[PDB]
């Protein structure tokens, strides 16, 4: 039956989401921190979307990567038509959800992906970081503190639940995030920030020797 | 069921990959060395892709040959739009994987092919050779030392594991590669190099009397 088929599809999607590297995103004093478990040096699961909007994903690389590209596309055209400060994390979070739902209903296989869109305030302004999680069906959830995506999310989510502290510095939030992620080695870690203090482009990767010194 | 069908497709692809001539690619002092077991004199399994990017394949000739052509196509147009030094082995390796995955999902029969994209540094620059292996599904793997494609890959991969030496000269790497490939005769061998010392076009075939003298 159709209902049975739908249930099977949901189970398949869940399985796909489960067998994947884990990513975390959490708010800290200077903005938002993305920490993903990533062995490759070329393939990335964290990306700039717009001036103050970042993006992390977990699942099947070609698909989440494809969404990455679609999201980049929409923001630039919108900004050109109206302006940079008009594109918000909210509008982008919304677009992905609608697209995902329609796509799943009309396509063959559902995207085994889990998305997190992050936004911080502009330069010289005060506002709390916003985290949204978009799931494979189109559901969207507003997160106040942190998002955990891919793999087994329960232990990481709980460890973060005990260790999280608002207004933690960059080093403390990095320790908390790596610790809860372990529930690792300097190599194979993809770390980036949405630094609210930057004048325009807030996204900034933290790689190599500096990262080693921090950890 | 669909899952069962997918498993059957994977098995079929594996069988196709298995019944084929073996190719090896390995890093040596002057760049990268391709050594394939090829009886025909007209049909080739090693090819120039761009100035410093080479290509080897194993499987069904018409298909791997077709990818060869598609890859050649993309690089020239890209270079004309931006420039020669902008096309990299990484971008090409990526394109094939995405295309293969989409193609397999929407087509009838999966491409019974296995690809290896190789890149060396430009003239007067220092950088390690990069080898990527792209499999029939779209998976891509970053190899530090050597790639073995087609046929029974275990014995050749192990023999190379014992014999490999970084910064081996051209003759030593040729002996190692032919020896591990045997795990043959002067005839029916397709040998080419990505010589890092050439000014622009790095790919260069090694055929006939010179090859005989070397071996």
């Amino acid at each position: 039956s159709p209902e049975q088929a739908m249930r099977e599809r949901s189970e398949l999607a869940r399985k796909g989401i489960a067998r994947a590297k884990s990513v975390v995103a959490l708010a800290y004093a200077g903005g938002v921190l993305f920490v993903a478990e990533n062995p490759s040096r070329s393939l990335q699961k964290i990306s700039e979307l717009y001036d103050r909007v970042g993006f992390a994903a977990a699942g099947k690389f070609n698909e989440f990567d494809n969404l990455r590209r679609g999201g980049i596309q929409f923001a630039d055209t919108r900004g050109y038509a109206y302006d940079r400060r008009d594109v918000t994390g909210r509008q982008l979070a919304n677009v992905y959800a609608q697209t995902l739902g329609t796509i799943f209903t009309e396509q063959a296989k559902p995207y085994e992906v889990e998305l997190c869109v992050a936004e911080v305030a502009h330069y010289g302004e005060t506002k709390r970081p916003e985290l949204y999680r978009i799931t494979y069906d189109g559901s969207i959830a507003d997160e106040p503190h942190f998002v955990v995506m891919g793999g087994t999310t329960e232990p990481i989510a709980n460890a973060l639940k005990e260790s999280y502290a608002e207004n933690a510095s960059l080093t403390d939030a990095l320790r908390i995030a790596v610790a809860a992620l372990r529930a690792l080695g300097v190599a194979s870690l993809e770390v980036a920030v949405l630094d609210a203090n930057r004048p325009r482009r807030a996204f900034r990767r933290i790689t190599g020797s500096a990262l080693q010194a921090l950890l | 069921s669909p899952e069962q069908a997918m498993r059957e497709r994977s098995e079929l692809a594996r069988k196709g990959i298995a019944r084929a001539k073996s190719v090896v690619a390995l890093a040596y002092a002057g760049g990268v060395l391709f050594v394939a077991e090829n009886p025909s004199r007209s049909l080739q399994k090693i090819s120039e892709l761009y100035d410093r990017v080479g290509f080897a394949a194993a499987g069904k000739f018409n298909e791997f040959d077709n990818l060869r052509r598609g890859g050649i196509q993309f690089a020239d147009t890209r270079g004309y739009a931006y420039d020669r030094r902008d096309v990299t082995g990484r971008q090409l390796a990526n394109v094939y994987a995405q295309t293969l995955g989409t193609i397999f999902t929407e087509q009838a029969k999966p491409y019974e092919v296995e690809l290896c994209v190789a890149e060396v540094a430009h003239y007067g620059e220092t950088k390690r050779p990069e080898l990527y292996r792209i499999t029939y599904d779209g998976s891509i793997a970053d190899e530090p030392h050597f790639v073995v494609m087609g046929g029974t890959t275990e014995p050749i991969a192990n023999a190379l594991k014992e014999s490999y030496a970084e910064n081996a000269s051209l003759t030593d790497a040729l002996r190692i590669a032919v020896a591990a490939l045997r795990a043959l005769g002067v005839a029916s061998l397709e040998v080419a190099v990505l010589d890092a010392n050439r000014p622009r076009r790095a790919f260069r075939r090694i055929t006939g009397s010179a090859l005989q003298a070397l071996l």
Binding site: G16, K45, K60 | -
Partner: peptide, 4 residues
């Protein structure tokens, strides 16, 4: 393959 290459799940991530």
């Amino acid at each position: 393959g290459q799940y991530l």
